[PDB]
Each structure stands twice: as structure tokens, then as C-alpha cells.
């Protein structure tokens, strides 16, 4: 499970926003600058930016 270091503020409804402390399961994208993770709360999708999170 990855951890959101910086609060990611999404501008659209597609990618969900997460504050500092929310965890998300990484789906794919090992590099680049935009990965997709699935929150473990409501069980929805949340394109998390490669930046703003870190494996921990």
C-alpha cells in the first residue's frame, strides 16, 4: 500500500483527492508522472500523481 505524502488536490472528479495520511493501492505505472491507485475506503478509483505519494 502506498502513502500520500503531499495532499493531492485533483481538479476534476475523475481522480480523487487525498490528504497527507490517506493510503492507496498502486495499480500500475512504475515511472512517468501519473499512477492510478484504488482507495481502500469506498473502493473507488483515484488516479494518484506519481508525485505526492511514496512507498512505505
Amino acid at each position: 500500500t502506498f502513502v500520500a505524502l503531499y495532499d493531492y488536490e485533483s481538479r476534476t472528479e475523475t481522480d480523487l483527492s487525498f490528504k497527507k495520511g490517506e493510503r492507496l493501492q498502486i495499480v500500475n505505472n512504475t515511472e512517468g508522472d501519473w499512477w492510478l491507485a484504488h482507495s481502500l475506503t469506498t473502493g473507488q478509483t483515484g488516479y494518484i500523481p506519481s508525485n505526492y505519494v511514496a512507498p512505505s
Binding site: 503531499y6 481538479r11 508522472d33 501519473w34 500523481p49 508525485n51 505526492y52
Partner: peptide, 9 residues
């Protein structure tokens, strides 16, 4: 510091 602003995908 200076969080990397969303690089437009």
C-alpha cells in the same frame, strides 16, 4: 519544498 505542480499529465 516547492511541491511539483501537476505537470499536465
Amino acid at each position: 519544498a516547492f511541491a511539483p505542480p501537476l505537470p499536465r499529465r
